[PDB]
Symmetry: D2
Subunit: 124 residues, 4 copies
């Protein structure tokens, strides 16, 4: 049996990689945070669902984003209940964007993994 | 031009269908709440990732669960930022189970929809 | 021992009295939700702390507010850890205002009670 | 004109003092984090309300607690709405105790301040 605090620091270690990969615009750094089964979704400018396989995120990070030395992320919330967790991350100044991200995570074989990311892109 | 209260009530209308569909053991009632691209994941007794396409949830509701008039659900939290939302739902005495569910939702073409559900099954 | 859903239901019964008292502009309906020790605080137009004993809330409700049949409240979040809990309530169209409220509650002699409310008043 | 990330970091700076004063068992470190009108409450072993002015907290920190090098705190959640915020902090191994704390904060004259803390003490 583990404490809230122990699981929190394990989850922050995983989400840390996401935040670092985002800021460095290097998908290699964030890839280990995600299950192979993970999905990414948001809504586009026409209010339509956009996304799919997590590789789509790695593609945008690698091909579209630029390294963002001034990006600043806040892990606003981590809710943890047994093998399940949700997290909110807010990021300013990441490749010209401000985001709020919501993550669903599960503790698989002793290690926390992201199975779903969704986001909202804040107006510029 | 929506308030938090307005969006909250919209999301509760969606999440209500999930709660109702589970208590009635009727996938037809909950189906409208989910995007076709939604996934469901949890961790099995061997700590392995279990789940996939949301159709798997509907199959379990239709083929494993039975109507549970004593089922009690609590929408513990809804976090809403623009087009994205996270929710936590705890359910007691649903076909012999106790769950904590975390949901990722997006407001697609003016309507909230679930793109990911994860869960933890509580013991005993 | 009690479940999350059970404690959630108990807290909502308490917070419901608060929402009804506000909507009816009748402090007697809400009074039972608050400890005799409870306080209220927010920030005034000059960014200064304003409030003190919870009776200051009851005085505003009774002397300043009017019944607001179109008021709509959302209990956005209730976090529960043993004997302690936090809640967020958003309310639209209560006597011309829109608020976000945060509550700290404790389970005292078997019963949930508010010991602190704070609030943010949104633009009209 | 401030972002969530900006307010989050301002609030963490304040809550850091609380976690630091606690770990070092030095109330002078934590004192700036609390309004002069702040309260602290929990429930005692008889399930009765216990606490009052925040000076009571400082007394326990100085007279009961000893420096706890093993102490680990997690800022589990910070909800921020305008001039109001709530926070949850979980702490392991602090002078022999495990706590979950809930904070109400207000942004008073440009600076975040705690007006209420409540806590649950976890079993041994």
């Amino acid at each position: 049996n583990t404490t809230y605090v122990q699981e929190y620091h394990a989850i922050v270690e995983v989400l840390s990689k996401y935040n670092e990969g985002g800021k460095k615009a290097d998908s290699t750094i964030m890839r280990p945070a995600f299950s192979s089964q993970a999905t990414i979704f948001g809504v586009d400018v026409d209010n339509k669902l956009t996304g799919g396989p997590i590789q789509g995120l790695f593609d945008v990070i690698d091909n579209v984003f630029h390294p963002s030395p001034e990006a600043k992320a806040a892990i606003a919330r981590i809710d943890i209940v047994g093998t399940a967790a949700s997290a909110r991350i807010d990021t300013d100044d990441i490749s010209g964007f401000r985001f709020t991200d919501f993550f669903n995570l599960l503790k698989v074989e002793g290690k926390w993994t992201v199975v779903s990311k969704i986001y909202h892109t804040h107006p510029s």
